Structure 1
Amino acid sequence: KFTRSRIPEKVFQASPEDHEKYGGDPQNPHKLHIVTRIKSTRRRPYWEKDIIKMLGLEKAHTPQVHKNIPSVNAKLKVVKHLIRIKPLKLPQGLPAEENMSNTCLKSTGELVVQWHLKPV
């Protein structure tokens, strides 16, 4: 019978080669995930549909910010084959109330807090 899949824990234990490849240090892990649904929930189990709805990824190619905490990670593990997960990067730090209206999420995963739309 087709059932929910239990991913072995060793799958989510990064190696030094993976760290070098993906540019993420095991120490000081990133705080937030940018998650984009890149796959349809159609032809997938109702539990995956429900997990996608819970994560708020109903619209495809629409980035959503989530906490990098074990429970959210468990949900993302459940629906990992339908989503792209990247680390949210804050080159200028967290946006402040002053610049809250000038933010933009660049394709690189960086949430720049100044968006002038002018050449550098």
Structure 2
Amino acid sequence: KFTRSRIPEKVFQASPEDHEKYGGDPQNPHKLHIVTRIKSTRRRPYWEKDIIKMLGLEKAHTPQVHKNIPSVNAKLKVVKHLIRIKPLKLPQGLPAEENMSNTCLKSTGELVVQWHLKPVEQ
């Protein structure tokens, strides 16, 4: 019978080789996720369809930010085959009230607080 899958915890234990490959820092884990759905929920069990709705991933290729906490990660582990998970990067820190309207999320996962639409002078 096809039932829900229990993923062993050994799968989610990063080796030192993995850290070098992906550049993550285990001592400074990223605060937020960037979850994007890249696979259809059709031809998948209903519990995967429901979790996608809970995460706000109804529309594919639409980035969504979620907190890097065990409860949120538990939902991600169920539909990890339908999504792309990337860490959110803040080169200039969190957006402030002054630059709320000048933010953009680049394809590299970086949220830039200034977006001038001009070439760099350097």
Percent identity between the aligned chains? 100
Give deviations 1:61-116, integer Å, cap 9, x for gaps. Answer: 00000000000000000100000000000000000000000000000000000000
Q: CA RMSD in A?
A: 0.3
Q: Tell me the CA shift for residue 40 of structure 1.
A: 0.1
**Which secondary structure does the structure 2 equivalent of 1:80 belong to?**
coil
- In structure 1, runs of 5+ residues without a counterpart are none
- In structure 2, runs of 5+ residues without a counterpart are none
Find the aligned partners of 1:55 and 1:64 in 2 and give their Cα distance.
8
Find the aligned partners of 1:33 and 1:63 in 2 and give their Cα distance.
10
Give deviations 1:19-73, integer Å, cap 9, x for gaps. Answer: 0000001001000000000000000010000000000000000000000000000
Stretches (4+) displaced over 3 A: none
Q: Which TM-score applies when normalising by structure 1?
A: 0.99
Tell me how many residue pairs correspond in the alignment: 120
Find the aligned partners of 1:45 and 1:23 in 2 and give their Cα distance.
34
**Which secondary structure does the structure 1 equivalent of 2:81 belong to?**
helix
Q: Which TM-score applies when normalising by structure 2?
A: 0.98
